[PDB]
Each structure stands twice: as structure tokens, then as C-alpha cells.
Design a protein around this nucleic acid. Structure first.
Ligand SMILES: [Mg+2]
Ligand SMILES: [Mg+2]
Ligand SMILES: [Mg+2]
Ligand SMILES: [Mg+2]
Ligand SMILES: [Mg+2]
Ligand SMILES: [Mg+2]
Ligand SMILES: [Mg+2]
Ligand SMILES: [Mg+2]
Ligand SMILES: [Mg+2]
Ligand SMILES: [Mg+2]
Ligand SMILES: [Mg+2]
Lengths: 50, 126, 142, 186, 106, 48, 101
RNA sequence: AAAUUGCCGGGAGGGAAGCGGAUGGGGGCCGGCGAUGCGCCCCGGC
RNA sequence: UAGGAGGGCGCGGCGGCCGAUGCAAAACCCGGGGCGCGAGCCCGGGCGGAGCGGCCGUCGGUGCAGAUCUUGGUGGUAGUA
């Protein structure tokens, strides 16, 4: 995808963020992933785990 | 261009598994179809009747798909995917696909000679 | 990879443009990956050239004698494809190519995983160029 | 010939990997494979075996029950391998730390505005890899509407199973087998 | 007494006596010597793609083939195969590789 | 308070301006979910 | 004679997906546009594009001619991909080459 | 294309033929069917 | 066996990706060479003279030895009655 500079700055106004009614679409917030950080390397090799 | 396989290829059966009663009829193809009869001597496995394929006739995993060359075959359509067998020429053998042109075959074979890749079709279409 | 390497692998482990799979999905399946920056072109997460920040490529150069390019991805510049790979055009002989590859792959702890494989591909590429120069003097079958 | 049932091969089955091909769930699966293998914590074993569950074996757990379960145990981190739904029937929620697959966007806001911290299973694996001071939970499994239909048949004595009826009303299975005055009382 | 030979060989003390750790307690002080890191070649001409294996110097030391009891230097033997089958010859001595050495006389 | 900026790549014959990047959208960070993508694409391409 | 169970016009041609599930899927697709390894895996020639996500100025909005659009693709790295499509156009194998495809 | 027929060359036959497992004898066909290259050295220049 | 499930092979489309093709595609023939236990696949040669394949997702008028099956052809009976 090649975004023009007009479209890119209003992609936020269109899809919004993790806030109620922030999106131009009604009844929609961005899905949240089942993991915040998907780096198995960093998880498994972190000091806590190791 | 020297085979890497260091184990003798053993085959528990070389004869094909022809379909039961492929002999009496012409319309029946030679390809195997399990006899589903209720009184079929083949399904009941009387001695003297054709043998069915079991899983027991399977060949060793470490000597499977090796040609008589002791290489596993890999079919290549062009130089682009010929060149990706650099570090498998001791275990993988190129075969130029059956529908390429003789012109492109010359190029693939020339490329494979200098990449030192075993090819079983270097005398094809000339 | 804006997303992490493991996630890229779980995204492209089953289909991508660089994957050549033949002989079906049975026990006969043969899998290679033909992206430029995969060394053995084996389609695994160790060697995958798309699911990794730190990848090395060893390629014969364009039409010119005995010039090898060794490239390593820049980890930090990673969302900049035009400036994504540090390419290194070296044309010296083999022993000094091997020392430099060890310098760029293993000795700086860039990615010691691919110490031996990168050198093996370097041997193969070097002798490929050597025979493109000289010709088929050896049948290479004993 | 040896006297065995099915040659001894185990005839029961269990999940060994989720039917779901969710890449994030597969990555959690790899993480907890590592943890249960190198760590030998029974907690990791249970968590793994419960990521290998369907959504009817992972029913939602709401705060009105989570707060019950957290009443006086704020030091321990709550773990629910499932979903946290809010519950507009509770008013004051203690600031609690809960790890789960999903949070309904209103329940996550409820927890944040209550001042607790709302985790995923990787963040859980950061500060409780062996599960120090954790409180594992399950939602109500047999609370599902479909379960009200299971068990011994509707028309046998002592069974309180809901029979499949296309609509409630006087005309829909009330007459003969549900009262003495028409036939018999089930 | 093959079994008795096996036991006497397998005894730990006699394993010491055979492997001769004494007179290795002679050269290197009164303690067994260390080993080092040889083979500093650092000059690989070529890198094989598959996992590298070098050649074997067979460290196994096969027992010499035993001679028959009824063969003594000075017997008359009977050849059986080859161009001299049936020839009656003389066994001179068992040569060092394990084969009999015979003469006609010629 | 941190989100990366995307530099806009201007073209030839573009006026000079003291401009900076566009901050990365939050949508451009959403979970990448290939199974949902293939399911929804299956049904929407069956919808024509 | 007939065919078995003849095809009928009242099959389920159009299937329904939840509006929120369409939106979630569009979110995941937008996210996947931003990852260079995903685009390159998916089959686009991007070795010369400056930055991801690739964003060009509003001066692009005013262009009119196809030569101008090509020239715009030249500053960017897209034109390798555009050429890939242009020289990979070829007749569809099969019955599609007579069903108006 | 097969069913089916002819001609040419081969094969075999004491009231069936065909098929499975053994090899054996004929054929017909396979040079990735089967290798000649590694190390050590001395020039002679590259 | 009746039956149930899993993993695969194969035919024809659609959305994608990688290709082949007048230096010969599709099809079909072969005492040709192989791979797989097997469905089946890969290569060689001939005829052929213009298209075709592979991988991922997905869809279907999708796999024949029988039905006194349907259409078309061909036999033995027979150079007989
Ligand atoms: Mg019966
Ligand atoms: Mg037994
Ligand atoms: Mg009663
Ligand atoms: Mg015929
Ligand atoms: Mg007679
Ligand atoms: Mg027979
Ligand atoms: Mg024979
Ligand atoms: Mg049908
Ligand atoms: Mg048919
Ligand atoms: Mg038929
Ligand atoms: Mg049938």
C-alpha cells in the first residue's frame, strides 16, 4: 500500500484507537491482541523466566 | 556430486500392487483399488490371491525417495530454481521439468554443471 | 519486520512468494525457499530470510569474475527496505573471504548460528565462480 | 496373539494442540511448552492443558464472581484462561491484577478505572513463570444454556432437563405427561 | 578357559596392570599427565555443506587369526581351490598377515 | 508519550516546507490475524 | 435426461459476516500492510522503497496523466512491482479464457 | 484412445486360459548403469 | 464385514503467488527409466501444432466394474442359419 499524505493523517480519525467513540465508525474499537509482545525469544530468554 | 546416503536402500517389495482382476478385463485400470466385496478372496486374504498394500510394506524413512542414484529428486523448471540446490547437491538431484524447451534445458544443464548439481536429464531433448 | 520474528514465522510458515513446495503435502513433500538472503534455502525458522532480523546472504555478484557479495541485514534500519541490507562486495581470495565472513557473522556475535552454514555457502559460491572461470576440469564424482 | 483390548493402544483422546490456528495462541502454546518442560510447575501444566480447550470449555467469568474470588486476596494475581466480562451488578471492585485471554472492552475499562492492572498470559509469564502467588480460576462450565438440556431424558422420573420446545406457551408440551388431569405427571 | 581369561582381563587391578598406568606414573611426576589442545590447523581450504566428519584412523586392534591345532611348521597340506587344487604341498610357516605360506617344492 | 513518526517522501517539484512526519496510526499496530483474514475474505469474495 | 439434484438459483450465494468482524479483518489487513517482511513474503518487489509505511506527499493528489503517475512511481520504489504486474499479464489458462476472463 | 481386425517378427501349447510367490532361460532397456580424484612435494610462471 | 473418524492422492473452477510454451503446450501411445505401502506422481521417446502446470486459501454437476444402467461402437456365434 502507498498512502498519500492526506489519507495517512486521517487514518487515525477513521479507525481510531483504544477509546470509546474515537473512531469515525460507531461501536468499534481496535481489537487487542492476545499478547502485548509476541517475541518468544525475549519472553523465554528474559531474566525472570530463565 | 557424490551421494551422501551411507545406508543401503532396501525395498520390501519391488513388484507393483496391481488391482485384483485387472488381468481378466481391459476396462479396469492397473491402479490399485481395495476390493470391497463381502466374499472377495482378496479382501479375505486367502493364500494364492493378490497381496494388498499394508503399511507394513513401508520403506525406511532414511532411505525413502532416494533414486537409484542415492539422491532425492527435485523437479526444476528454470535456472532460477536450479541455482537453489547449491548446498544440497550431495543429497538432492535436479530433474528439468518435462515441458521446458530444449533451449532452456541447455542453459539449466550448463548452469548445473558449474554449480556441480547431479541431473538425470542432461541427455534429454538433444 | 515491525512485528517480531516469531510472529512473522507463524504468519509465513505455510505460504509465501519465495516458497517452492513440490510433491504434494504427503511424506514426499519437498520444500525450498528461494529468497536471496536464505543460505541453505531450507524453509525453516533457523534459515528463514523473512522471519529474522539478523540474516546473512552470500551470493555471486553480477556478471563479473570472482566477486562475492556478503550481506547482513541492519537490525535497526529494518523498516527502511532501501537501506535494509549492508551489502559487501569483496573480490579477494578465499582465505581472506573466510576470515571476513567470520568477522561479520560469528566474531561480532551478529549471528553465530550461521557460522558454519555461511562459510559452506561461501565455499560453494566461490568454487562455482572458479569453475565458471576455468571450466569443467573435474568430474567431481569420487 | 496377546490378550489385550485394541492391542493396548490408548482409546481415549485429548487435545494436544488447539484446533484454533490463531498465531498468538500458537505462540502462547510454544511459550508454555517451554515452561512446562523446563520448569516442571504443575501450574504451567494446567495452564497449557487449558489453552488446549474449546470455547465451551472456556466459559466467561465476570467480575461479580471474580471479586468474590478476590475478596481478601489482593496479593495474589488472578489467572483465568478465558474471558472476563463485566457485571453491572457490582459497584466497588478492589484493585486487582487479573491475567486472561480476553477482556471485554467495558470490563477492562472497569478494572483500569478501579486501579488494578490487566494482564495477558505473556505478561503473566513475566512475573509469575512458575506461578508464584497466583490464583487460578475457571468460569462456570455447566452454566451454559445448552447444558440445561443434558442428562437423563425429560420424560423419565426425577429428571429436570429442559426439553427442546420450539416456543413456550400453554400449547407446547404441557398436556399429557406434565399433569395428572391429562394422562400422567411425567 | 575363555571365561577365566575374561574375568582375569576384566579385573580392575589387572586392567591397571595391562594399560600400564605405572611407568606413566614414572615420566610425568608421580601423577598422571594432562592432555592438551592439539590440531591448531585453522586453515580449512573447503567447507562441506553437510555436517563435517573426518577420516578414521582405526583405533580398534583386531586379534590375529588363529592357526589350527593340527597345523605345525613341517606339515604336508592339501590345496583345495585355485589352479593348484588337489596339489599336496608343505606348510612352511604362517606369515604375519594371517595367511599360510606354502611350498611345493617347486 | 512516544509513538514513531513516518517521514513523508516528497516528490520532484515539491515545495520546501519545515515539515515533519505523520505519527504512526494505532490501526497500523493492530493484531495481525491471518485466520480471521482468510475467513472474512472467503465470505466476502463469495458475496459477489 | 436430468442431472442429479439440479442446480437451483436459490443456493446461498451471498454469505454474511458480522460488521464488527469485517472491521476487525480490515484492521488486521492494515496492520499487515505495515510489515516489510509480510509484503515481501506476499509477493511484492520492494527492495528500493524508501520507508514503511510508504507515504507520499499531497503533491501526488494533483497528478492527471498516466505518464505522471509512472514518474511518481519512479521516485518511490513501486515501479519494480508495477512492471512485475505489467510484464506478468498473460492469458488466463482454462475455461476462463472463454468465459470473459 | 480402447474394444475389435489384418500383416510382419518373436514366444508357447496332452480336455481350458488368466492371477499370486520363487528364481531360471530368453529378450528389450538402463552410462547419475560404474570411479579415476584427493592429499604431500619441486619448478614455471600467474 | 456393517459402521465411525483422522491424514492424504486425484478432476474442474475462483481469489492470490511461482512459473513453462512454435528450440514444441494440451492430449494420447510405449518390451523406456524411476518415487511412494497406496491412491497416484516425476522423467525419457513418438504423434501432436497451441496452449499448460505447480503451491496457499476456497468452491464444486469431483473419482465407476456392476444398477436385465443410458448413448455410441465392437466382437465370438459366422462365412454358419
Ligand atoms: Mg460373507
Ligand atoms: Mg503380535
Ligand atoms: Mg409417576
Ligand atoms: Mg488396439
Ligand atoms: Mg482334442
Ligand atoms: Mg504365474
Ligand atoms: Mg527372471
Ligand atoms: Mg455426479
Ligand atoms: Mg467414467
Ligand atoms: Mg463403464
Ligand atoms: Mg461397485
Amino acid at each position: 500500500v502507498i498512502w498519500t499524505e492526506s489519507a495517512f493523517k486521517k487514518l487515525d480519525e477513521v479507525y481510531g484507537s483504544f477509546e470509546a467513540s474515537s473512531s469515525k465508525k460507531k461501536g468499534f474499537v481496535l481489537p487487542r491482541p492476545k499478547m502485548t509482545n509476541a517475541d518468544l525469544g525475549r519472553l523465554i530468554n528474559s531474566d525472570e523466566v530463565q | 556430486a557424490v551421494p551422501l546416503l551411507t545406508r543401503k536402500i532396501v525395498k520390501k517389495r519391488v513388484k507393483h500392487f496391481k488391482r485384483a482382476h485387472s488381468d481378466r478385463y481391459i476396462g479396469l485400470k492397473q491402479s490399485w483399488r481395495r476390493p470391497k466385496g463381502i466374499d472377495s478372496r482378496v479382501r479375505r486374504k486367502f493364500k494364492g490371491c493378490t497381496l494388498m498394500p499394508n503399511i507394513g510394506y513401508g520403506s525406511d524413512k532414511k532411505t525413502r525417495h532416494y533414486l537409484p542414484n542415492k539422491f532425492k529428486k527435485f523437479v526444476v523448471h528454470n535456472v532460477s530454481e536450479l541455482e537453489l540446490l547449491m548446498m544440497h547437491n550431495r543429497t538432492y538431484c535436479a530433474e528439468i521439468a518435462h515441458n521446458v524447451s530444449t533451449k532452456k534445458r541447455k542453459d539449466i544443464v550448463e548452469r548445473a554443471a558449474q554449480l556441480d548439481i547431479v541431473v538425470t536429464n542432461k541427455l534429454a531433448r538433444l | 519486520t515491525t512485528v517480531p520474528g516469531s510472529l512473522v514465522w507463524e504468519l509465513v510458515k505455510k505460504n509465501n512468494c519465495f516458497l517452492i513446495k513440490q510433491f504434494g503435502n504427503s511424506n514426499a513433500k519437498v520444500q525450498f525457499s528461494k529468497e536471496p538472503n536464505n543460505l541453505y534455502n531450507v524453509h525453516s525458522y533457523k534459515f528463514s530470510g523473512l522471519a529474522n532480523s539478523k540474516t546473512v546472504a552470500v551470493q555471486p555478484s553480477a556478471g563479473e569474475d570472482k566477486a562475492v557479495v556478503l550481506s547482513t541485514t541492519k537490525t535497526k534500519k529494518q523498516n527502511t527496505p532501501a537501506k535494509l541490507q549492508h551489502k559487501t562486495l569483496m573480490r579477494k581470495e578465499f582465505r581472506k573471504m573466510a576470515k571476513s565472513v567470520k568477522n561479520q557473522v560469528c566474531d561480532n556475535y551478529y549471528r553465530p548460528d550461521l557460522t558454519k552454514p555461511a562459510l559452506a555457502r561461501l565455499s560453494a559460491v566461490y568454487r562455482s565462480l572458479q569453475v565458471s572461470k576455468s571450466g569443467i576440469k573435474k568430474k567431481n564424482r569420487q | 496373539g496377546i490378550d489385550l483390548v485394541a492391542g493396548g493402544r490408548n482409546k481415549r483422546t485429548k487435545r494436544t494442540a488447539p484446533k484454533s490456528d490463531d498465531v498468538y495462541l500458537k505462540l502462547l502454546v510454544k511459550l508454555y511448552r517451554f515452561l512446562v518442560r523446563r520448569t516442571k510447575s504443575q501450574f504451567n501444566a494446567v495452564i497449557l492443558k487449558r489453552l488446549f480447550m474449546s470455547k465451551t470449555n472456556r466459559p466467561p467469568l465476570s467480575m461479580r464472581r471474580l471479586v468474590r474470588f478476590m475478596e481478601g486476596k489482593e496479593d495474589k494475581i488472578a489467572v483465568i484462561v478465558g474471558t472476563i466480562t463485566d457485571d453491572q451488578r457490582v459497584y466497588e471492585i478492589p484493585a486487582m491484577k487479573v491475567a486472561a485471554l480476553r477482556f471485554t472492552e467495558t470490563a477492562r475499562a472497569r478494572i483500569v478505572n478501579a486501579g488494578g492492572e490487566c494482564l495477558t498470559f505473556d505478561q503473566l509469564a513475566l512475573r509469575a513463570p512458575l506461578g508464584q502467588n497466583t490464583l487460578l480460576l475457571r468460569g462456570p462450565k455447566n452454566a451454559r444454556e445448552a447444558v440445561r438440556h443434558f442428562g437423563k431424558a425429560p420424560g423419565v422420573p426425577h429428571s429436570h432437563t429442559k426439553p427442546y420446545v420450539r416456543s413456550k406457551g400453554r400449547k407446547f408440551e404441557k398436556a399429557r405427561g406434565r399433569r395428572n388431569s391429562r394422562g400422567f405427571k411425567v | 578357559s575363555k571365561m577365566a581369561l575374561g574375568i582375569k582381563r576384566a579385573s580392575r587391578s589387572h586392567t591397571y596392570h595391562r594399560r600400564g598406568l605405572w611407568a606413566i606414573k614414572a615420566k610425568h611426576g608421580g601423577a598422571l599427565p594432562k592432555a592438551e589442545k592439539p590440531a591448531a590447523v585453522a586453515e580449512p581450504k573447503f567447507y562441506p555443506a553437510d555436517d563435517v566428519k573426518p577420516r578414521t584412523v582405526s583405533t580398534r586392534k583386531p586379534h590375529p587369526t588363529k592357526l589350527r591345532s593340527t597345523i605345525t611348521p613341517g606339515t604336508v597340506l592339501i590345496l583345495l581351490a585355485g589352479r593348484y587344487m588337489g596339489k599336496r604341498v608343505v606348510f612352511l610357516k604362517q606369515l604375519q598377515s594371517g595367511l599360510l605360506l606354502i611350498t611345493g617344492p617347486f | 508519550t512516544a509513538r514513531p513518526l513516518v517521514s513523508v517522501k516528497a516528490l520532484d517539484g515539491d515545495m520546501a516546507t519545515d515539515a515533519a512526519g505523520v505519527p504512526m496510526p494505532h490501526v497500523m499496530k493492530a493484531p495481525i490475524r491471518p485466520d480471521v483474514i482468510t475467513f472474512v475474505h472467503r465470505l466476502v469474495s463469495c458475496n459477489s | 435426461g436430468r442431472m442429479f439434484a439440479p442446480t437451483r438459483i436459490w443456493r446461498k450465494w451471498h454469505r454474511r459476516v458480522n460488521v464488527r468482524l469485517r472491521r476487525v479483518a480490515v484492521a488486521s489487513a492494515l496492520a499487515a500492510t505495515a510489515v516489510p517482511a509480510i509484503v515481501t513474503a506476499r509477493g511484492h518487489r520492494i527492495e528500493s522503497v524508501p520507508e514503511f509505511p510508504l507515504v507520499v506527499s499531497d503533491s501526488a493528489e494533483g497528478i492527471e496523466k498516466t505518464a505522471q503517475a509512472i514518474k511518481v512511481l519512479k521516485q518511490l520504489g513501486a515501479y519494480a512491482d508495477a512492471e512485475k504486474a505489467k510484464d506478468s499479464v498473460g492469458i488466463r489458462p482454462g475455461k476462463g479464457k472463454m468465459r470473459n476472463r
